[PDB]
């Protein structure tokens, strides 16, 4: 069983949306410039993908925070970094965490990346690859 | 690589994740169901699940060029993403609707099996996600 479960609805075109059922979420869709779309003000499923794992990943943060008993710095942010290559996705996670060293700081991204989600979803299938920035 | 996304997530409950160019300035809330406030922001299910249907949709529009195939319009993907427990471990629980009106069954069934090969959010779920693909249509 679903401890919670999200719903979003999708139309095509190019005039599309997607649109969450609660209306949380409530976006239009563009093809970027550089896929050869017009390159409108609408979002597309990696920068969808990208702001999701990095959101995935702050909330795996968390999860692992209240585990291990570790404080995690308030101001630590998460860029996630999604490549389509032509289909298949690459990755780039990077977490900045003021005041933690390299270390630290890399042992907080190997432990969120084993609890999040979409880390698990995408097993083996895209190259996920973790960095700390200073 | 024909394109590249960029997002940063910020947290604690003041939470927002933001793509580098101004296309999604989003708040994030922790859904009431999982003991958080239920505030105005998505999450990262909810996310997926508007990623994931907005991905089948320029499937289906790859689709229909290579095949020179017309789909509707009025066609709808609805996907519903659900958070499990799985140990000290969290999956993802999957499935992709699709309404496509003035199609046969058999039709639309096609379509969907036709996207669900194409689409890079199956591709990178493939054997790890037991994706379940319907038909409303």
Same mark, same amino acid.
């Given at each position: 069983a679903n401890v919670y479960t999200a719903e979003a609805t999708a139309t095509g075109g190019r005039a599309g949306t997607t649109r969450s059922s609660d209306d949380r979420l409530n976006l239009d869709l563009s093809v970027p410039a550089e896929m050869g779309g017009?390159?409108?003000?609408?979002?597309?499923? *990696?920068? %969808?993908?990208?702001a999701g794992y990095a959101?995935?990943?702050?909330?795996?943060?968390?999860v692992v925070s209240r585990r291990n008993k570790i404080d995690v710095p308030?101001?630590?942010?998460i860029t996630a970094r999604v490549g389509l290559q032509k289909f298949a996705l690459d990755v780039e996670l990077e977490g900045h965490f003021p005041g933690l060293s390299r270390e630290q700081? *890399?042992? %907080?991204?190997?432990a969120a990346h084993e609890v999040c989600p979409y880390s698990a979803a995408t097993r083996n299938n895209?190259?996920?690859?973790?960095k700390v920035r200073e």
């Open positions: 017009d390159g409108g003000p609408g979002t597309n499923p *990696e920068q %969808l993908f990208a959101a995935c990943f702050q909330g795996a943060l968390g308030a101001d630590s942010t700081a *890399e042992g %907080l991204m190997h895209v190259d996920v690859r973790l």
